[PDB]
XYZ file of C-alpha atoms in Angstrom:
555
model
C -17.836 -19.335 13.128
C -17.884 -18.363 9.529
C -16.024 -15.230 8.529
C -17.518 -11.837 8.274
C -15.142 -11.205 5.245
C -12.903 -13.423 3.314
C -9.435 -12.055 2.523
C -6.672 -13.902 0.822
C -5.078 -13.556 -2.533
C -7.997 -14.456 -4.516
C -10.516 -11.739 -2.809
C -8.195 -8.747 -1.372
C -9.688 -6.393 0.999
C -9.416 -2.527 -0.137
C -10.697 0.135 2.946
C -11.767 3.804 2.536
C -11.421 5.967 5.150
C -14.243 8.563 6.944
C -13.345 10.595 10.123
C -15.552 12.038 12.851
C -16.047 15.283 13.285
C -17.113 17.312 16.833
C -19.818 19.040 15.062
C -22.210 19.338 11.809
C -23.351 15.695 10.296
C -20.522 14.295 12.235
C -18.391 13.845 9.314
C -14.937 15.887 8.530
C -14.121 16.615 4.592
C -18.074 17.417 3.937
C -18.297 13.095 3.642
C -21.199 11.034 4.124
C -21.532 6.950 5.138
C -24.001 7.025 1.759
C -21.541 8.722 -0.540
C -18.100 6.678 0.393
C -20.307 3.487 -0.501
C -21.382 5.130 -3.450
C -17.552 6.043 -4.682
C -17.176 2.309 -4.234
C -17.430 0.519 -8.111
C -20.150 -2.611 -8.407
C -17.366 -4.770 -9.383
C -14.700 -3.685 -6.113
C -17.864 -3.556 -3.908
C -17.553 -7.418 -2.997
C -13.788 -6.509 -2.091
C -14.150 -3.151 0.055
C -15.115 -1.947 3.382
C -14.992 1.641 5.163
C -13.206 2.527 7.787
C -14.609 4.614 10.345
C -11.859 6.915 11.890
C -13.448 8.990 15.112
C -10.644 11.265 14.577
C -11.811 15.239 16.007
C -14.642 13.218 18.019
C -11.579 12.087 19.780
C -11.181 14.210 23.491
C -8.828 15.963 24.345
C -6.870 15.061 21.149
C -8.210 14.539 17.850
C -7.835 10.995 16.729
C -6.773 9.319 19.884
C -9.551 7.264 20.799
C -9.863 7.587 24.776
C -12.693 6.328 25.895
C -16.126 8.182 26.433
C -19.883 8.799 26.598
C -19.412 10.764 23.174
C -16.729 8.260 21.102
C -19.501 5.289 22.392
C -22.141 7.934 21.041
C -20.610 8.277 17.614
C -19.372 4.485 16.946
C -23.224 4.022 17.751
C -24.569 6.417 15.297
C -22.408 5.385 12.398
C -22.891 1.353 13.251
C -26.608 2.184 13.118
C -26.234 4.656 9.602
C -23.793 1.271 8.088
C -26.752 -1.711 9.222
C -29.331 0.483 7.757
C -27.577 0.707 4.155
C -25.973 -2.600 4.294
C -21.798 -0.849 3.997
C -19.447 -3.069 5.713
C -17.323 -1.046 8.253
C -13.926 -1.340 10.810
C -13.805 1.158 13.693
C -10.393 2.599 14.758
C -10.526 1.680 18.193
C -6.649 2.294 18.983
C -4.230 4.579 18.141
C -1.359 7.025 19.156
C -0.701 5.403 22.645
C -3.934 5.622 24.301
C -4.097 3.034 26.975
C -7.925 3.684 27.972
C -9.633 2.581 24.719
C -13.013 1.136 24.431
C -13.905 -2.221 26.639
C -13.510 -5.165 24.953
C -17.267 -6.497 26.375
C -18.259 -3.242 24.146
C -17.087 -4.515 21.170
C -18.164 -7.776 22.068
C -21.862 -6.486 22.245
C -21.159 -4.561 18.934
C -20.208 -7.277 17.344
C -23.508 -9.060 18.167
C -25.445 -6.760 17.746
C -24.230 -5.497 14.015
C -23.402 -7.960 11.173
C -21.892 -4.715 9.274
C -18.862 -4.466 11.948
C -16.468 -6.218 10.297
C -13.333 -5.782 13.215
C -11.496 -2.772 14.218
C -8.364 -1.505 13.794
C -5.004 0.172 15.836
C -3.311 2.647 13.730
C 0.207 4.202 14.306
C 2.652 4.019 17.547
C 6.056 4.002 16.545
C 6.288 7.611 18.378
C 4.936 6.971 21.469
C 5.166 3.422 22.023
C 4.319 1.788 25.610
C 3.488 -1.932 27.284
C -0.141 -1.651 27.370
C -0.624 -1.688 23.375
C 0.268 -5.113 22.242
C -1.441 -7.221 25.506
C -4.601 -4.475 24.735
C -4.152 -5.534 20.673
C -4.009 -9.208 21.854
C -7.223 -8.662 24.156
C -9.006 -7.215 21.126
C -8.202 -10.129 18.697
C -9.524 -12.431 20.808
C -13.102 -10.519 20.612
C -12.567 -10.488 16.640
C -11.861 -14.217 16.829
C -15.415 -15.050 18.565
C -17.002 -13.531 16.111
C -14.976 -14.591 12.684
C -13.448 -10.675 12.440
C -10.608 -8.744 11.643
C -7.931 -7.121 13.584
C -5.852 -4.851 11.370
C -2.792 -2.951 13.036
C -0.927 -0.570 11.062
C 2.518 0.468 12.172
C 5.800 1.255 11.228
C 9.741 0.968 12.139
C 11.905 -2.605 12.473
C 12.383 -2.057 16.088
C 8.848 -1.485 16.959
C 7.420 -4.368 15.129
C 10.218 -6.158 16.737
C 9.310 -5.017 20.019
C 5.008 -6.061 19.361
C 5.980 -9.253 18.561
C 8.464 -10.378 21.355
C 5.360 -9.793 23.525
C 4.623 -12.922 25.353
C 0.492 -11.774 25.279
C 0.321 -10.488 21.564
C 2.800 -13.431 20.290
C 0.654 -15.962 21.961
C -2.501 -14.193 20.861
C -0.964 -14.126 16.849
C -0.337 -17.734 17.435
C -3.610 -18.775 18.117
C -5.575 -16.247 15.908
C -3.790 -15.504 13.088
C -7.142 -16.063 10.888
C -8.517 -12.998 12.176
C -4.966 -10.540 12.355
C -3.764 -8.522 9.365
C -0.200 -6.741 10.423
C 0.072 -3.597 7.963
C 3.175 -0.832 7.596
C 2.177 2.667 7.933
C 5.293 4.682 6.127
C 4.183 8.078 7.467
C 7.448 8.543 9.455
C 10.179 8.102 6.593
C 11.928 5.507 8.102
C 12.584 2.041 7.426
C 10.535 1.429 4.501
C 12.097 -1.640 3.060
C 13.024 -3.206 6.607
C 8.998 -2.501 7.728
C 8.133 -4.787 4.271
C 10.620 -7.179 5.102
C 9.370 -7.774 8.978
C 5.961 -7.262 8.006
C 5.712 -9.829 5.340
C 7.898 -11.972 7.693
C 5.158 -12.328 10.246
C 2.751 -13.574 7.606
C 4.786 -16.475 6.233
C 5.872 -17.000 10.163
C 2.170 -18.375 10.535
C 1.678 -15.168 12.514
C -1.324 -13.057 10.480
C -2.992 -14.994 7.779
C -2.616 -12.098 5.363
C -0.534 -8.141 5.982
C -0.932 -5.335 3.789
C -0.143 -1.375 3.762
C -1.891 1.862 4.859
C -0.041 3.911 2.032
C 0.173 7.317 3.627
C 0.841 10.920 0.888
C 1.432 12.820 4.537
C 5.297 11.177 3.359
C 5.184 14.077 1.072
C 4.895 16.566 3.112
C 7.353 14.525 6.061
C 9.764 14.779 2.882
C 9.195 18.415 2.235
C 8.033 17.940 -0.998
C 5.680 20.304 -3.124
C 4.879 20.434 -6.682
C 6.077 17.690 -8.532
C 9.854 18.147 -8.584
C 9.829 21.326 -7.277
C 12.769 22.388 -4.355
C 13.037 25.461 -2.318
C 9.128 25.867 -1.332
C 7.404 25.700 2.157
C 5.726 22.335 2.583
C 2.037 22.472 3.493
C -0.932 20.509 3.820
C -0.729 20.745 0.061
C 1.774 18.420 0.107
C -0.701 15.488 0.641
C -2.059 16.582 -2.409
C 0.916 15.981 -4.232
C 2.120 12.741 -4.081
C 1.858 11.463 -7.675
C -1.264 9.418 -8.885
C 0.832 6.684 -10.250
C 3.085 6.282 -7.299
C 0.521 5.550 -4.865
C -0.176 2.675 -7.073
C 3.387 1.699 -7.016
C 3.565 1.484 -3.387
C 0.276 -0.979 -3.719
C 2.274 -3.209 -6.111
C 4.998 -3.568 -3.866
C 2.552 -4.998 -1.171
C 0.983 -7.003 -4.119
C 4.281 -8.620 -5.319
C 5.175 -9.476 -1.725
C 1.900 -11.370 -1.158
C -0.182 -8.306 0.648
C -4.141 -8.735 0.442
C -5.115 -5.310 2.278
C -4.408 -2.184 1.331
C -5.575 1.210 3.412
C -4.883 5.430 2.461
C -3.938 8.583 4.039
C -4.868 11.544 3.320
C -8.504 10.761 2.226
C -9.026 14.524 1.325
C -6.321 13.477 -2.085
C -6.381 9.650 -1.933
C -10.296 8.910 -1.453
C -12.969 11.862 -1.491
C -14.296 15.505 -0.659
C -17.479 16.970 -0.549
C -18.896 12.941 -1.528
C -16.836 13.667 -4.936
C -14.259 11.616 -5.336
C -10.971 12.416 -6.115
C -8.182 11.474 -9.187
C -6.157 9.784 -7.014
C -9.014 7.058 -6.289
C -10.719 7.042 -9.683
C -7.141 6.758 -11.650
C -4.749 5.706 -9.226
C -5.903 3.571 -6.405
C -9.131 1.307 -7.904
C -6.691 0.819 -11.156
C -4.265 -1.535 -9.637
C -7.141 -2.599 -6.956
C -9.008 -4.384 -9.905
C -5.858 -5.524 -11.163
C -5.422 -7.181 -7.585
C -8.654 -8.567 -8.084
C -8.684 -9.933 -11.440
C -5.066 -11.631 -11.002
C -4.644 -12.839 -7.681
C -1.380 -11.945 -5.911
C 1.549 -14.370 -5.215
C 0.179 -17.238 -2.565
C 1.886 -17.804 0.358
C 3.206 -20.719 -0.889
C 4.237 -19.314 -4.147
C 6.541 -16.822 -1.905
C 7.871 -19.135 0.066
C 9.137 -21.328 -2.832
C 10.849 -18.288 -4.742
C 12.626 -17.121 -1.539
C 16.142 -18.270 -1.538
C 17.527 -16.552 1.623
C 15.927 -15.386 4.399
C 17.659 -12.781 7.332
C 16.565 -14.013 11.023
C 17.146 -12.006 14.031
C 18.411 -14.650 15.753
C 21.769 -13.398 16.101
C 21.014 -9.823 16.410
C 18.154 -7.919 14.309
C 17.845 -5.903 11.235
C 16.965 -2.790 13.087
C 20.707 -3.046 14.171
C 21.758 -3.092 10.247
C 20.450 0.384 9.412
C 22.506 -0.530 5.864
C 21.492 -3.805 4.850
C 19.511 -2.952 1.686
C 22.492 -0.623 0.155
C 23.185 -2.223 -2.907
C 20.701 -4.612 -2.869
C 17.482 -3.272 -3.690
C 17.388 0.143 -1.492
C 19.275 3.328 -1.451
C 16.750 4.872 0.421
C 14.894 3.485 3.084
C 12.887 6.822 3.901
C 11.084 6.159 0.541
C 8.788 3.293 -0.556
C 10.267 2.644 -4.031
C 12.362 -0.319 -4.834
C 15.340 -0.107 -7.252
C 15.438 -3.453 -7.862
C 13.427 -6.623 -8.184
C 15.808 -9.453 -7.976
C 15.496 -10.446 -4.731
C 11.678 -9.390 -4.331
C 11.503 -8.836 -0.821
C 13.479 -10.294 1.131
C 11.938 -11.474 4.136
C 13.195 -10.935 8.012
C 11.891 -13.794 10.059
C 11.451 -12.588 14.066
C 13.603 -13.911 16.641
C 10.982 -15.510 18.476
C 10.448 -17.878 15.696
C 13.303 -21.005 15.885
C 15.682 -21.916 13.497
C 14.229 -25.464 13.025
C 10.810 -23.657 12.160
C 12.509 -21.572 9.488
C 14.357 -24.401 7.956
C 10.564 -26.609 8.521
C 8.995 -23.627 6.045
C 11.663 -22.911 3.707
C 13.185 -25.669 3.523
C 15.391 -24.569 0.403
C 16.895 -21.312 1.734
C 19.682 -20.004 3.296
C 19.370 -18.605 6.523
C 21.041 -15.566 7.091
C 21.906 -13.779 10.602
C 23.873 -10.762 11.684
C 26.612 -13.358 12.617
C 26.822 -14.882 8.876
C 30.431 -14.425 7.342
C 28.515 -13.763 3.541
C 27.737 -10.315 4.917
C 31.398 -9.694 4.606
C 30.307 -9.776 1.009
C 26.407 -9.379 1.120
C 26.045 -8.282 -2.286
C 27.822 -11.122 -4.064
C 26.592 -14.063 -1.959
C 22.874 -12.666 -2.612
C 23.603 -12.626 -6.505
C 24.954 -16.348 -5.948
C 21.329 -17.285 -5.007
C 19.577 -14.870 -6.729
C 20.346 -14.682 -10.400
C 19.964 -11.313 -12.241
C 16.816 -11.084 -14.708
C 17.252 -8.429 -16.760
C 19.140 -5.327 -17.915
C 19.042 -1.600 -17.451
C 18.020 1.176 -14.488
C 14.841 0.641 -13.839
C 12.651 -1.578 -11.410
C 11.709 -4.613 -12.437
C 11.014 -8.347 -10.676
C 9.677 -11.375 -11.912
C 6.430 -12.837 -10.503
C 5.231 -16.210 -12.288
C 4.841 -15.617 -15.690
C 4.818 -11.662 -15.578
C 7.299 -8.500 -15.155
C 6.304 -5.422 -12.660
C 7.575 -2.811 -13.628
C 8.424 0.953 -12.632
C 10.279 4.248 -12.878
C 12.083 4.270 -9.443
C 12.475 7.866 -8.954
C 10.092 9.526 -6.872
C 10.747 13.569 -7.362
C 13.559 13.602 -9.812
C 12.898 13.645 -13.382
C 14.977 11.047 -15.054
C 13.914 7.902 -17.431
C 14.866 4.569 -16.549
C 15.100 2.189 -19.092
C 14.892 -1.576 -18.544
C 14.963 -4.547 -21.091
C 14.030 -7.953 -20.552
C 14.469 -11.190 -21.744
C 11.210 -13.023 -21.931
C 10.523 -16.653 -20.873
C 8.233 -17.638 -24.080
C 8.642 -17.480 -27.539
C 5.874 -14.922 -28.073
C 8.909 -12.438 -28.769
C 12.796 -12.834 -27.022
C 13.148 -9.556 -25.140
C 10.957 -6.532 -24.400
C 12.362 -2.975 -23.335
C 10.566 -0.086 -21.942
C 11.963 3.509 -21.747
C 9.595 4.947 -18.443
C 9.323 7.981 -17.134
C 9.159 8.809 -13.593
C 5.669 7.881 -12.045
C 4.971 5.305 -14.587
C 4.451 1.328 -13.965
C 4.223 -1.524 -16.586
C 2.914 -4.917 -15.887
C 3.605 -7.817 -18.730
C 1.903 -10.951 -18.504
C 3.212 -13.758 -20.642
C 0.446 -15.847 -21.483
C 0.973 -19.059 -23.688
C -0.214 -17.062 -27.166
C -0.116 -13.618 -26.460
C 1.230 -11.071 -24.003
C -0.862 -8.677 -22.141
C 0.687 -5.079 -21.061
C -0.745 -2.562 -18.839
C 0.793 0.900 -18.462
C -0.078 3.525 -16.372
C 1.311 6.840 -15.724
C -1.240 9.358 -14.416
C -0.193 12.261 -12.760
C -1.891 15.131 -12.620
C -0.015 18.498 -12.544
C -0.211 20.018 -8.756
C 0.959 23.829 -10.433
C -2.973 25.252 -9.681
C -3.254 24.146 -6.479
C 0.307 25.468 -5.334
C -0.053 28.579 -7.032
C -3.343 29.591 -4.581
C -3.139 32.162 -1.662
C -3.581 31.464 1.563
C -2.195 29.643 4.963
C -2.513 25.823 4.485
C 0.005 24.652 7.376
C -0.043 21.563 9.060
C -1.304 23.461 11.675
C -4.887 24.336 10.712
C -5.061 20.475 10.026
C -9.024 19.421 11.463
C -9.550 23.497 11.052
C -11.266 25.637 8.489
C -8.391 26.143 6.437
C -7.981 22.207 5.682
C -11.664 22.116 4.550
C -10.955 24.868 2.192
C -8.372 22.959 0.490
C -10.835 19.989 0.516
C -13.454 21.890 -1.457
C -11.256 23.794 -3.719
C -10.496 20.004 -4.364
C -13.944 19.139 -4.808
C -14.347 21.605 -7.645
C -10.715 21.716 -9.064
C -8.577 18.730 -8.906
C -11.705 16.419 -8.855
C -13.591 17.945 -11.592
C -11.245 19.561 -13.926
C -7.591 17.921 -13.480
C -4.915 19.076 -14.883
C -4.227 15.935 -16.856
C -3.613 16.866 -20.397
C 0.165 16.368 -20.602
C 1.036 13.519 -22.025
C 4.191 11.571 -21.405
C 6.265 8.746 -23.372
C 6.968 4.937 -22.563
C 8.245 3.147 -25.321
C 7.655 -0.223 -25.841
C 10.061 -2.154 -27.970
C 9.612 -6.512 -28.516
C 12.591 -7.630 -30.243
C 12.302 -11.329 -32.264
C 7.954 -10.879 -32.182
C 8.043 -14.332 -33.670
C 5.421 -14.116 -36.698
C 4.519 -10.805 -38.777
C 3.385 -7.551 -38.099
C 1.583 -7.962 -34.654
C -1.982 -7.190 -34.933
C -2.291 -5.083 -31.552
C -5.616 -4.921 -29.732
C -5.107 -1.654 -27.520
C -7.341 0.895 -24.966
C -6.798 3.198 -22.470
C -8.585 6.235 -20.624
C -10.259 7.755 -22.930
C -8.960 10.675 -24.483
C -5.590 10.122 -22.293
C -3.547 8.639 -25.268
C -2.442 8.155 -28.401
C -0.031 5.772 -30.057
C 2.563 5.307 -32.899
C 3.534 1.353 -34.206
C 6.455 0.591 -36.016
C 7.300 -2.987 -37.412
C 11.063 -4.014 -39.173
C 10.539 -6.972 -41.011
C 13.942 -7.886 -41.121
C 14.830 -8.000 -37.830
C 11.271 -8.482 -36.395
C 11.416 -5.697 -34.144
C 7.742 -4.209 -33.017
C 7.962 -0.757 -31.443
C 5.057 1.158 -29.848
C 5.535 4.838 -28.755
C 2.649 5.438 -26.305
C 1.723 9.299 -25.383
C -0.029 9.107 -21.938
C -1.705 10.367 -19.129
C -3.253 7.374 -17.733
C -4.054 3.909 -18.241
C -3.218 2.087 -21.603
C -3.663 -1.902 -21.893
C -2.634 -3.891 -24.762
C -2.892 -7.587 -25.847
C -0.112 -8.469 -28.813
């Protein structure tokens, strides 16, 4: 069977969420099928799907998809809107426990029925986990896998993915169909970000899913109790969504990227996708940015991550989840967070106990295995710098991926620079250093003749939309008050952001081999502006970028 959409490295998968709603066109955040295809660029079309969320169609609670007469109703209606416009579509057919989810023989005859239905997905558990939900997700693959689909579960937490996947019926199941699974984090609950990665990523070079990727969820912003950019001492709200910065979403996109992710999913879709069929800042200059950079420069193989992995931790011998401080002083403080501080050891993945030791040594051959019972952990940090060697100087985020540097600011609501300065593997110059601000990435690729930079920074400022009166709890979430946010959006953020202050990063190549680089530079258009300086005597090229926004050079 041939399938219904190819995802791998060289053709990643991005999805864009719509929701049901109990009432009107049957759409919440004043959305249609026609518009979120329409908010989809020509050139990501070929790389994008919708998801189709029946969220407040959902009885008796919103989102969790029990079956009946009315969730068959609506999956129905919006399969028949999607064949009629040609819009490739998932349904969210599990989620938040519910054991009495659609039949698989339904989805069977969906899937015949509708060459648009692309495969389905199960979407967060980790607080009300129980037995039926992997054998279920197991019973569901198998569907997909008749009909060359996708099954794409996103969850969160070590021990619960360790739990899914010490499941005799969803092991087996991964096993057989791993062509047609994606595994995906979700890091809603502020919990075990870099562990979730690690396990996550794990399964994939385990053979498990053929590719895993990320539903990167702004709701962390509010879990946080974060406002306006930097801001302490206010009440969180469902502003908070609203408020994660632009740039940072992407960041949390390169860090599936750089770890070999292909799929990449968004909460909440009234900031990160579209209200009112406008959409937002957050898509336009955030998201589809460093979605078409996935696109035009395909992410690390499989095989490529394999090969630069020198240690990997198995649960063997007792699990990560039990090692609530293994990333200290590695490459997380802060495991409620997404953000990496460091890049040295990419990450690093945890291989599940269900896989044997002669397996792991069969795929990487050329790394050490690490357990709970290893005596290096006596002195993790140092026996990890013995295998992995350090790349470059300074505070900031940076790893090495082929023959380019990702780069970031790793504060998320503190405003600090980072600075970071790195030695460069061709002669095109010897080192280049960036000064960053927070919510800012870099990416330099070194190509034989010439590098090529991109650095992006937006973030818009979130001052207007805190500054409003009126009640925008949590509570009124799928209520009136939500879609007033969501058109105040549509006519505000979406229309007339607050993106005219500019910010620094300074880019500085020391030993530019020949004479005064001639640069060829762009950027969103009246979102920069730019200052060179050349010293002939020590060859030193600096450029002082002001930015909101997107700037790409080639030197």
């Amino acid at each position: 069977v041939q399938m219904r959409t190819t995802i791998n490295n060289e053709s990643p998968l991005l999805l864009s969420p719509l929701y049901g709603n109990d009432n009107g066109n049957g759409l919440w955040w004043g959305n249609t099928l026609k518009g979120a295809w329409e908010a989809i660029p020509e050139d990501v079309k070929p790389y994008a799907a919708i998801e189709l969320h029946p969220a407040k169609v959902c009885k008796p609670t919103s989102c969790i998809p029990r079956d009946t007469k009315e969730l068959r109703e609506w999956y129905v209606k919006m399969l028949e809107e999607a064949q009629s416009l040609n819009i490739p579509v998932f349904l969210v057919i599990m989620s938040a426990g519910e054991r009495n989810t659609v039949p698989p023989e339904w989805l069977d005859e969906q899937f015949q029925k509708y060459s648009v239905l692309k495969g389905v997905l199960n979407i967060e558990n980790y607080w009300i986990y129980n037995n039926q939900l992997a054998p279920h997700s197991a019973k569901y693959l198998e569907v997909c896998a008749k009909y060359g689909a996708h099954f794409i579960w996103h969850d969160h937490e070590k021990w619960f993915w360790e739990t899914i996947m010490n499941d005799p019926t969803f092991f087996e199941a991964s096993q057989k169909y791993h062509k047609n699974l994606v595994l995906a984090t979700k890091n809603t609950p502020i919990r075990d970000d870099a562990g979730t990665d690690s396990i996550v990523s794990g399964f994939w070079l385990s053979g498990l899913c053929d590719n895993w990727g990320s539903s990167t969820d702004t709701w962390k912003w509010w879990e946080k109790h974060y406002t306006n950019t930097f801001e302490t001492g206010r009440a969180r709200d469902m502003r908070s969504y609203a408020s994660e910065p632009e740039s940072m979403i992407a960041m949390e996109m390169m860090n599936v990227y750089t770890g070999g992710g292909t799929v990449y999913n968004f909460e909440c879709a009234a900031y990160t996708f579209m209200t009112n069929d406008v959409p937002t800042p957050a898509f336009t200059k955030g998201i589809i940015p460093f979605f078409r950079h996935a696109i035009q420069n395909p992410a690390p193989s499989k095989e490529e991550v394999v090969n630069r992995t020198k240690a990997v931790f198995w649960n063997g011998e007792g699990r990560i989840s039990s090692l609530n401080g293994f990333y200290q002083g590695l490459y997380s403080n802060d495991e409620t967070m997404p953000l990496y501080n460091n890049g040295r050891y990419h990450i690093l993945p945890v291989i599940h106990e269900k896989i044997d030791k002669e397996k792991i040594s069969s795929i990487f051959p050329n790394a050490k295995i690490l357990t709970k019972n290893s005596e290096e952990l006596s002195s993790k940090v140092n026996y990890l710098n013995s295998l992995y060697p350090k790349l470059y100087e300074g505070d900031g985020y940076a790893q090495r991926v082929g023959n380019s540097w990702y780069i970031y600011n790793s504060n998320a609501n503190i405003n600090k620079n980072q600075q970071v300065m790195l030695p460069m593997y061709t002669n095109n110059t010897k080192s280049l250093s960036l000064d960053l601000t927070p919510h800012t990435y870099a990416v330099v690729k070194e190509n034989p003749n010439n590098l090529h930079i991109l650095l992006n920074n937006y973030r818009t400022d979130k001052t207007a939309m805190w500054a409003l009166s009126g009640n925008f709890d949590a509570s009124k979430s799928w209520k009136k008050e939500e879609l007033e946010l969501a058109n105040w959006i549509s006519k505000n953020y979406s229309i007339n952001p607050v993106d005219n202050d500019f910010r620094t990063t300074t880019l500085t190549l020391s030993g530019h081999t020949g004479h005064k680089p001639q640069i060829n530079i762009s950027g969103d258009k009246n979102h920069y502006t730019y200052t060179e300086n050349w010293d002939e005597n020590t060859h030193v090229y600096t450029i002082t970028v002001n930015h909101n926004g997107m700037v790409e050079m080639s030197i």
